[PDB]
Amino acid sequence: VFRRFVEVGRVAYVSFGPHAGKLVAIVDVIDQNRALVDGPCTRVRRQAMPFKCMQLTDFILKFPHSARQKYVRKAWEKADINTKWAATRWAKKIEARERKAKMTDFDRYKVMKAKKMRNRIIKNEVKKLQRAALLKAS
Amino acid sequence: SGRLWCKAIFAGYKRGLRNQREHTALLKIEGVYARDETEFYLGKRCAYVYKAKNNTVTPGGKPNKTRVIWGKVTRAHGNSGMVRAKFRSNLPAKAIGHRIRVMLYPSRI
Amino acid sequence: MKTILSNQTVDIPENVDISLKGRTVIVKGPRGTLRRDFNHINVELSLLGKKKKRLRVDKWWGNRKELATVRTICSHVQNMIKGVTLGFRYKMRSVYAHFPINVVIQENGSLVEIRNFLGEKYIRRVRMRPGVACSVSQAQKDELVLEGNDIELVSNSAALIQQATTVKNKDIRKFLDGIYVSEKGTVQQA
Amino acid sequence: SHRKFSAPRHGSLGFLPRKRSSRHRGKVKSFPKDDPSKPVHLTAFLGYKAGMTHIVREVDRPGSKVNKKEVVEAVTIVETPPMVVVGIVGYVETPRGLRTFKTVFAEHISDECKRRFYKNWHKSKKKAFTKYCKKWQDDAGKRQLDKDFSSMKKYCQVIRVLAHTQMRLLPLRQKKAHLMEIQVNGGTVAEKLDWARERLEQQVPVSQVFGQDEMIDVIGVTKGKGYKGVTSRWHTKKLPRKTHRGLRKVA
Amino acid sequence: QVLVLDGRGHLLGRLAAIVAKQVLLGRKVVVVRCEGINISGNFYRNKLKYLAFLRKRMNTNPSRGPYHFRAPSRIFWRTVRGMLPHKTKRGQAALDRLKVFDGIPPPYDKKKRMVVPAALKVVRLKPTRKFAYLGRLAHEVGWKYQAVTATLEEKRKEKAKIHYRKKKQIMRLRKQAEKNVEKKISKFTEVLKTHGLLV
Amino acid sequence: TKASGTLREYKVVGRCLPTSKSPAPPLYRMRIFAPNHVVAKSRFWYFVLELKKMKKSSGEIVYCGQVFEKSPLRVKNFGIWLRYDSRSGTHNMYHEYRDLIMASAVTQCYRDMGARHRARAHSIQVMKVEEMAAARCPRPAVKQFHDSRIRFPLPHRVLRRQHKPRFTAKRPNTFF
RNA sequence: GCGGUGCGCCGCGACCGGCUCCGGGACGGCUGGGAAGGCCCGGCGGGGAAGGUGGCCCGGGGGCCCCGGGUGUUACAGCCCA
RNA sequence: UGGUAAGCAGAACUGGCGCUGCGGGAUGAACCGAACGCCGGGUUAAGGCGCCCGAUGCCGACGCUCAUCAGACCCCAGAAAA
RNA sequence: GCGCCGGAGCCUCGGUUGGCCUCGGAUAGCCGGUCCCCCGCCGGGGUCCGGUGCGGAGAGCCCUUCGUCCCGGGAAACGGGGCGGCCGGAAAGGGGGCCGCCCUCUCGCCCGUCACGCACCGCACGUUCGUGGGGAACCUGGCGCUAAACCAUUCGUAGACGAC
Incomplete structure (x- = not known):
């Protein structure tokens, strides 16, 4: 049933720590609970990093288990993980999560005025979809 | 209009175990649960409103029955967003687990 | 330590359709449907190949006492297929010295009378497990035949009618009387 | 140091609050558990200890030394005049216990059943169940009565029937009847409640509840003896006469 | 402002620790489905741990002795009580705020009941380690109304299913009132999405 | 020595000081794994006094410098020879580790000799740390990671950050 | 007006100084005059094995697509040295 | 040193208790830290930081261990051979 | 002289400062849609299709409130507002959702017009739940209720005395 596997050259999303919110590639498995991880196009240095901080994504790209930072950089831009990330719903709702937490008090007003009206239009329409059910069985 | 203060709880005094110092209160401000988020509230004015x-x-x-002991959020307490406050009169132990109002208006933003 | 991976494939034949909702398996074939729930075991039951011609049970990062839980699911499901294709038949012969252990089945197999065990005027009425039915078969004077799909129930209900006829407050080495599981086989022969 | 010679313990502690029974009429703590395949029946009755006499019967037990031989057995005659069902009370099944859902009394409650609702019957204006009576003889009242039997066949699981003793038919001094919830243990809760409403304001003789040669359970309060010493109450060993401060006590 | 916590699948002390702390901070907590609480360690250990509790009774008058409460609501209430200064007034004013129930009664059956993930068996026990249901524990050591609670708990699950099915029905309508009505909510929607509420 | 934090490898060279009998005695180099240079210069004498007629008073430390990693990115296999005190007798042990860094694979030995054997750092004497090519590794806990196409999932992802809401309204997902 | 002196009570602010606890910036020294790494192209040449890439074989999974053995040193991946 | 040993009896050296509060060891004359005018702020010791109870509500690190009698912090308050 | 429904004010106890109206549950797995098919009175079962670091997200949702005019544009007309039917609810029964009028406006909600309301002159307990709980009596209108308990007396199934 497991879909994502700690595989040699899996793109993994770092959740917390120094390099939080960055895609690192699993270069080699060091230990039972740590891996050598590099992200040259995402500005993560070739370094050891535990599996507890990284949420491993659904991208695997072919380089050998000992390949130096240049041969990771080739496979990162050959596949083009920077653009293929930001079109994933997960990536789109990290940067949507960023936006709501960066919302100004003036921006918070303009959204409240939008949400109020945007809800009033649907609440009128669902109530009309509600009468469209009651009207069939009579 | 609307609310101009944040919900804090008088969660006891500054105390070891077998000694309490009644001059300093320990405030639990709602929402902030780390030392990173308690930095906004340092120097803010805190009111224990009773009647x-x-x-x-x-x-x-016009004369209400409502009263106050005004205070001040002096510094952070512990590792989990608890904060030290110091009131002009030492808060009564009646107020333990009751609402005090950490205000906004020693504002720095 | 933690072994990175331990797996063991069950070569399930053409005659059997095994399918699995979660780590619960359902196994059906020529003679009925067997369902066992392996919620207690904490493994990955994969079912792979076209026609699903084998089961694959993975255990990732397992200590010594968790790699023991791979071959148990293998053997349990293998006996969940033998019961589904060939069934299970535990022929058990009634040993006595003097008194004939007089066995006849009420409730068309689901209850076993045991009369005249060591001249006991008490009569023992052993209710069989749901699915299994005893039968005093021919061509052997003292002979009980249980038949059923579940290896568990045919064997459990055999050990009910074995532990029913125990010799109390005597030397059990001299008094070898009772009904004992003489042959573990299958209902129909491969 | 130990009990030199071992002896069993004087009395049981399985009743040990040895106090005046706060009820004079004995409560049925536990009625029998029902199976809804039985016919509908009252599970209990309420009598009066009349007296005591001999009996002679030819004992029909094989094996005994008194097989087909006549014995003298002591018997208690309990005068059990037929009881009047005057109400039904439904019990809903709750996780905190077994809550009384709703009581429904009858229209005509007997004048002796009224006396139980009074400490002083002489002084009272006797207005008990005079407004509840009017629920039956108004068109809007029968409805909310019928919405209870609708509710109490639905929500309730334990249906008990209020059946008082008819005190007029006894040589006793008292006129104040004894109310008692008797658990109707029978079929479904619907059938159980249709049956008790049929028995409402009606006689129930003992033949309806009990039959001949039946093993039953007699519940009641003991013959009161007042303040009794430990030699009388607990039946302990008396002390050997030379004792200074009393011989009729626990040493 | 009432924490209606779910008791199902939570650990007995882990939840009691967090309940006892909130309640001292002037919070009114309701812990519900207390039979659903389970204690770490296999069943026979935890039963023996509670059987030993039954034996600790006052020799000269057990009526004075430790009141061994059997119901899972009052086994959970007791373990919270031990984590409070219940001899003082603020620890007695504490227990007045806490309100503990078996199954889920009427006020709370039609209320979204919270979960403490820090006090949760799936989170806090290794899945290989055995645990003991407080529902089974209470029953076998003198609690009477397991089967009575279980049916009323089942009579609301089938009742609360009909709510959820009728909520999925409104939520199908709501999304189908967005495919239909997208042309005239767009200028309103496309400022929600610039502030990251919908993407 | 308290085996505190991550250990650093030190090249501590020291000579028995000039005499009339021996003006220029032979220099003695050692691989000392220490939290800092002060206790590297302490543990230098501990091992040198055990081997040579040389206390700190009748000697000097000529160069106590930290030796860094010559391949801190290459994941390597380290064979450490131990000499630890049990509660009864002392034991020679060959133990394998798998770290980027020599000095952290030695740290990973100090946490493990504590974990398994309750051996506090003063009991332990690291005598030899050798990088081993992946055939010369007998202990199978390291040999399971000698795999070109190594592939394991992260099976039961127990969540931390259990207190950030503390009162969520959903049972936490653990399959990822 | 200035200077002294205070407020009936409840308060607020301002800057200066003392002592404090943290945050942000920026500069420099040293080492094996850091170790590794990035970037030019694994520059030209030679070598070695492996947790063995392609090649080929083996065994079988798919409508030609891919996994699991073997062979052996760069090919349609890389890795450590001279 | 005597004694099987003793919260036993008898010495040497230093420090305690007595005469002495305080923080910690839940609680203890002596243990550990530190000795005391009355106070405000700061910071520590020895101990701690699920809750009682101030403080881990660190996305702490790597292991060990399942007990039908778990284990859990100097003095110290229950164990051995096997 | 008390129970139901229908202003003016004095005491007293103080806590609060918007709501969440609900699947069951899994965890080595989930959530949400569909008919060629199937047993069930429109429920379950799949099959397929999407989602899954939960976005049909509690990291969420709902309500968001200086007041009003004048005049516009989208938006609503299946709307808002309150008087008599129908239409819900036991584990500790609740304030709902609807189909019908007698009905009052085309106002409420989102952008822009046009001016205005102690603009109380930098300042604190403001803003709420709240006609909150409790305690007395006062003006009062309909609609309504006319009891017991204890002593005493008596009994003796009871009893030191109370109690029963």
Whole structure:
């Protein structure tokens, strides 16, 4: 049933720590609970990093288990993980999560005025979809 | 209009175990649960609002029964967003687990 | 330590359709449907190949006492297929010295009378497990035949009618009387 | 140091609050558990200890030394005049216990059943169940009565029937009847409640509840003896006469 | 402002620790489905741990002795009680705020009940380690109304299913009132999405 | 020595000081794994006094410098020879580790000799740390990671950050 | 007006100084005059094995697509040295 | 040193208790830290930081261990051979 | 002289400062849609299709409130507002959702017009839940209720005395 596997050259999303919110590639498995991880196009240095901080994504790209930072950089831009990330719903709702937490008090007003009206239009329409059910069985 | 203060709880005094110092309060501000988020509230004014039997004057108002002991959020307490406050009169232990109002208006933003 | 991976494939034949909702398996074939729930075991039951011609049970990062839980699911499901194709038949012969252990089945197999065990005027009425039915078969004077799909129930209900006829407050080495599981086989022969 | 010679313990502690029974009429703590395949029946009755006499019967037990031989057995005659069902009370099944859902009394409650609702019957204006009576003889009242039997066949699981003793038919001094919830243990809760409403304001003789040669359970309060010493109450060993401060006590 | 916590699948002390702390901070907590609480360690250990509790009774008058409460609501209430200064007034004013129930009664059956993930068996026990249901524990050591609670708990699950099915029905309508009505909510929607509420 | 934090490898060279009998005695180099240079210069004498007629008073430390990693990115296999005190007798042990860094694979030995054997750092004497090519590794806990196409999932992802809401309204997902 | 002196009570602010606890910036020294790494192209040449890439074989999974053995040193991946 | 040993009896050296509060060891004359005018702020010791109870509500690190009698912090308050 | 429904004010106890109206549950797995098919009175079962670091997200949702005019544009007309039917609810029964009028406006909600309301002159307990709980009596209108308990007396199934 497991879909994502700690595989040699899996793109993994770092959740917390120094390099939080960055895609690192699993270069080699060091230990039972740590891996050598590099992200040259995402500005993560070739370094050891535990599996507890990284949420491993659904991208695997072919380089050998000992390949130096240049041969990771080739496979990162050959596949083009920077653009293929930001079109994933997960990536789109990290940067949507960023936006709501960066919302100004003036921006918070303009959204409240939008949400109020945007809800009033649907609440009128669902109530009309509600009468469209009651009207069939009579 | 609307609310101009944040919900804090008088969660006891600054105390070891077998000694309490009643001069400093320990405030639990709702929402902040780390030392990273308690930095906004340092220097802010904190009010313990209660009311008694007798009427007392109200500044810019007619005499209510409502009273205050005004204070000040002096510094952060512990590792989990608890904060130290120091009131002009030492808060009564009646107030333990009751609402005090950490204000906004020693504002730095 | 933690072994990175331990797996063991069950070569399930053409005759059997095994399918699995979660780590619960359902196994059906020529003679009925067997369902066992392996919620207690904490493994990955994969079912791979076209026609699903084998089961694959993975255990990732397992200590010594968790790699023991791979071959148990293998053997349990293998006996969940033998019961589904060939069934299970535990022929058990009634040993006595003097008194004939007089066995006849009420409730068309689901209850076993045991009369005249060591001249006991008490009569023992052993209710069989749901699915299994005993039968005093022919061509052997003292002979009980249980038949059923579940290896568990045919064997459990055999050990009910074995532990029913125990010799109390005597030397059990001299008094070898009772009904004992003489042959573990299958209902129909491969 | 130990009990030199071992002896069993004087009395049981399985009743040990040895106090005046706060009820004079004995409560049925536990009625029998029902199976809804039985016919509908009252599970209990309420009598009066009349007296005591001999009996002679030819004992029909094989094996005994008194097989087909006549014995003298002591018997208690309990005068059990037929009881009047005057109400039904439904019990809903709750996780905190077994809550009384709703009581429904009858229209005509007997004048002796009224006396139980009074400490002083002489002084009272006797207005008990005079407003509840009017629920039956108004068109809007029968409805909310019928919405209870609708509710109490639905929500309730334990249906008990209020059946008082008819005190007029006894040589006793008292006129104040004894109310008692008797659990109707029978079929479904619907059938159980249709049956008790049929028995409402009606006689129930003992033949309806009990039959001949039946093993039953007699519940009641003991013959009161007042303040009794430990030699009388607990039946302990008396002390050997030379004792200074009393011989009729626990040493 | 009432924490209606779910008791199902939570650990007995882990939840009691967090309940006892909130309640001292002037919070009114309701812990519900207390039979659903389970204690770490296999069943026979935890039963023996509670059987030993039954034996600790006052020799000269057990009526004075430790009141061994059997119901899972009052086994959970007791373990919270031990984590409070219940001899003082603020620890007695504490227990007045806490309100503990078996199954889920009427006020709370039609209320979204919270979960403490820090006090949760799936989170806090290794899945290989055995645990003991407080529902089974209470029953076998003198609690009477397991089967009575279980049916009323089942009579609301089938009742609360009909709510959820009728909520999925409104939520199908709501999304189908967005495919239909997208042309005239767009200028309103496309400022929600610039502030990251919908993407 | 308290085996505190991550250990650093030190090249501590020291000579028995000039005499009339021996003006220029032979220099003695050692691989000392220490939290800092002060206790590297302490543990230098501990091992040198055990081997040579040389206390700190009748000697000097000529160069106590930290030796860094010559391949801190290459994941390597380290064979450490131990000499630890049990509660009864002392034991020679060959133990394998798998770290980027020599000095952290030695740290990973100090946490493990504590974990398994309750051996506090003063009991332990690291005598030899050798990088081993992946055939010369007998202990199978390291040999399971000698795999070109190594592939394991992260099976039961127990969540931390259990207190950030503390009162969520959903049972936490653990399959990822 | 200035200077002294205070407020009936409740308060607020300002800057200066003392002592404090943290945050942000920026500069420099040293080492094996850091170790590794990035970037030019694994520059030209030679070598070695492996947790063995392609090649080929083996065994079988798919409508030609891919996994699991073997062979052996760069090919349609890389890795450590001279 | 005597004694099987003793919260036993008898010495040497230093420090305690007595005469002495305080923080910690839940609680203890002596243990550990530190000795005391009355106070405000700061910071520590020895101990701690699920809750009682101030403080881990660190996305702490790597292991060990399942007990039908778990284990859990100097003095110290229950164990051995096997 | 008390129970139901229908202003003016004095005491007293103080805590609060918007709501969440609900699947069951899994965890080595989930959530949400569909008919060629199937047993069930429109429920379950799949099959397929999407989602899954939960976005049909509690990291969420709902309500968001200086007041009003004048005049516009989208938006609503299946709307808002309150008087008599129908239409819900036991584990500790609740304030709902609807189909019908007698009905009052085309106002409420989102952008822009046009001016205005102690603009109380930098300042604190403001803003709420709240006609909150409790305690007395006062003006009062309909609609309504006319009891017991204890002593005493008596009994003796009871009893030191109370109690029963």
